[PDB]
Protein: ATP synthase subunit c, chloroplastic
Amino acid sequence: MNPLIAAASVIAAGLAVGLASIGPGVGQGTAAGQAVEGIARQPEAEGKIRGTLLLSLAFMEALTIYGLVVALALLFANPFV
Amino acid sequence: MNPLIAAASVIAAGLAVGLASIGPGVGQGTAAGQAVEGIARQPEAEGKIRGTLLLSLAFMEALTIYGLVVALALLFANPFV
Amino acid sequence: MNPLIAAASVIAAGLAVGLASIGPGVGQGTAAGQAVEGIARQPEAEGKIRGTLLLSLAFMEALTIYGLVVALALLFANPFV
Amino acid sequence: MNPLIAAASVIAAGLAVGLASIGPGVGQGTAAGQAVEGIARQPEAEGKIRGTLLLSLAFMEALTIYGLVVALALLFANPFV
Amino acid sequence: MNPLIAAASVIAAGLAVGLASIGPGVGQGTAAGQAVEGIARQPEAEGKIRGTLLLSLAFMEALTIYGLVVALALLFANPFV
Amino acid sequence: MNPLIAAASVIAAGLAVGLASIGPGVGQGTAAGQAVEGIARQPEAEGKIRGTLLLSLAFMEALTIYGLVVALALLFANPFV
Amino acid sequence: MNPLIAAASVIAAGLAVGLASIGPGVGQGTAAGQAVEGIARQPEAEGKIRGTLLLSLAFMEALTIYGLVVALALLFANPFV
Amino acid sequence: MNPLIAAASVIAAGLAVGLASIGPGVGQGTAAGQAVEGIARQPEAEGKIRGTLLLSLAFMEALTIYGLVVALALLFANPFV
Amino acid sequence: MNPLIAAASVIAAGLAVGLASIGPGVGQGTAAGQAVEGIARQPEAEGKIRGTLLLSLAFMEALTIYGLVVALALLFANPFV
Amino acid sequence: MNPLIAAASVIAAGLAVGLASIGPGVGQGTAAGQAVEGIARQPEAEGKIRGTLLLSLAFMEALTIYGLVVALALLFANPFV
Amino acid sequence: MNPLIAAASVIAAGLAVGLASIGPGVGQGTAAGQAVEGIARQPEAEGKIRGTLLLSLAFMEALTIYGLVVALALLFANPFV
Amino acid sequence: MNPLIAAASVIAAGLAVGLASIGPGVGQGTAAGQAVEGIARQPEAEGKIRGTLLLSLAFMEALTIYGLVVALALLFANPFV
Amino acid sequence: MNPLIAAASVIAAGLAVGLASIGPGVGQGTAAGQAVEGIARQPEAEGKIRGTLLLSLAFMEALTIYGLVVALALLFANPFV
Amino acid sequence: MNPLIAAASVIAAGLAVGLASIGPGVGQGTAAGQAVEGIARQPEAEGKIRGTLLLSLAFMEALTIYGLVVALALLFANPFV
Structure:
């Protein structure tokens, strides 16, 4: 009853943060890999490449942070428990 | 009964935000990777490349935000609890 | 009974929006990646490339929006609860 | 009992629209990606390429719409509830 | 009892239409992608390419339509409910 | 009891037609893709290519039709209900 | 009891025919794809290519037919019901 | 009890034949694909290529037949029912 | 109770033979594919290629036969039923 | 009751840290691999390459650390137990 | 009770031998494929290639045999039944 | 009750350490593979390559160690049992 | 009770040895394949190649042996039964 | 009670060691494969290549050993049984 909501909440938190890193994890690697390959091919373009990569890493990091925010909400701002 | 709806809601929220980052995570990486590869090959085209990438990252970020919106609705604007 | 329908509805909503971004997420990345690669190779064709990409991103975004619409219907226009 | 049909219906709706975007999502991206690559290689063929792509996107969009139609039928034209 | 058949039927309908688009979704994208690549390489062959593609898209669309037909039968021509 | 057979039958039908399109879906796309690529490379061989493709599409379509036949048998020629 | 065997039988039939097309579906596509690619490269070898392909398609079709045979046996020659 | 053995047996039969075609399905396609590619490249070697392919197809077909044999044994030579 | 051992045994048999063909199926195809590609490239080496392939097919066939042996033992030499 | 929340919490912790390393694990490898490939091709660019890689590894490491933080919170800062 | 151990044992045996062939199956194919490719490219190196392949096939076969040994132990040398 | 927390804890520990090696396992291999390829291509760059690889291996090893730490905490610093 | 521990132990043993061969199976194949490819390209390097391969096969074999050791411990050195 | 903890512990041990070899198995193969390819291309660099590979194999072996350590702890240093 009262325990079920809390039990469901902690499971939801684990799933939220756990699953949220799978896509962005693979994606950040793909971006970063082509970035350093680009720098090796065109060292003078490091600034342009690093700038575009950082922008990209931020967009992908945000995806996982949405998962963290929900997990933290389920633990420390839970409106049902 | 009353606990089951809340329990289901928090699980649904975790799933919504967790699953929603898998595709866009991989996708943003693919786009970002070819972007920095393009910049390395054609540094003078950085502006055009960064512009088209940012447009693409926004479309893909939105996919995951739909998941976040539903999760936030299930937690803080729940119509059944 | 009455709780089961609501419980099923919130789970369905989470699944609907969560699953709906997997394909379009990967797809938008593939399209966007080849778009910026194309711009790097042929900067003069940016307009034609961006036009075709935007059309494609819209078709793929719609796929996930169908998921969002059903999720929002299950939460805020539920005909069974 | 009476709630089981409605509960099954909302789950079915979520699955129908959620799963239906996975294939067409990936597919539309593949098509759109080769389309913009083609335009970059042969800008004079934009019309032919855009025409064939649009035809293809429609065929793939329909696949997911079948899922949406069933989901909407399960929610708003349910013959068992 | 009477509810179980209806409950099973709506789940079956969702699965039928949902799963049926995964393969044809990916397939149509592969075909369409090589079609527009072919048009870019050989614009004079557009007619032959579009003809063969359309034939292929129809064969693949049919695969998913079999799923839709069964789903519609389970909802609106159910012989057990 | 009596409802279980009908309930199992509709689930079996959904699975049969749903799963049966996954392989042939991907396969038809692979075949069709190389077909249009071949036509672009060798337009004079369209007839030979279209002939072999049609034969191949039929073999792959049959795979999914076996699924449809079983589904239709489970719904409209069920020997247990 | 008596219903359980029939219920298990129809599920088994659906699984048998459904799963049996996944491998052969992908396989037939791979074979057919390289066949039409071969015809495009070497049109004079169409006969040899089509002959070897047909042999291959038969071997792969048989794999799925084993699934159909078991499904038909479970439905119409069931030794337990 | 008595029904459980028969129920388990039919499920086992479906799984046995269903799963047994996944690997050999993909494998036969890989072999057949490289065979027709080889014939296109070296038409004079058709006999040698077809001979080695047929040997390979037999070894892979046998893998799935082991599944069929067990399924047929579970249905028509069951020592427990 | 008493039926549980027999019920578990038939399920185990189905799983044993079903799963055992997945790896060797894919593997035999990979080996056979490169074998016929090798024969096309170097027809004079057919004997050496066929010899090494046959050795390899035997090692891979054995993997699945271990599954068949256990399945046959569970059905016809069961020490617990 | 009191045990269920603790039981759910430890499971959630395991899932959180376990799942959170899958994506970043693959991603860090992709980035690091292209980094050392880049250094081999352009040894003079080691500094630029190492700098961009380290930035990327930090972004990807953070993804998994979010999982660790939630796990540690569930164990040692649990607000429900 | 007494039946549960035997029931668990036969399931364990099926899983042990079934799962144990997946990796080695794919692996042996990869090794054998590059072996025959090598022989085609360098027929004079057949002896060296066959020797290294046989060593490799033995190491991979052993992986699956560990599964067979445990399965046979669970059936015919079970210390708990 | 008291056993459930301990039972959940040991399962969580197994999952934590088991799952945590999947990503970093694949990743470390990718990095190490390109490292030795780089050394072969540019032996004079061994030091730079080994330095960047070691940094990368540490970042990836840490991912799995987070899993080990949680597992060890669940076993030997469990705050709920 | 007493049967549950033994039942869990035999399942654990099957899983341990079954799952433990998946990675090392694929890995040994990758290593062995590049080894024989290397020998074909550089027959004079057979000794160096075979030596490094054997070292690698041992490291990968050990991974699966850890699984066998645990399985054998669960069967023949079980501390709970 | 006492049996549940022991039962959970042996399952956890099997999962821990079983799953822990999947990633490192694939990874070690990737590294070892490129190592022997490198030796074939640059036999004079064997020492440098073998050194970097061994370092890498150790890092990857450790990943699986963490799984073995937890499994051994669950069996022979269990703090709950």
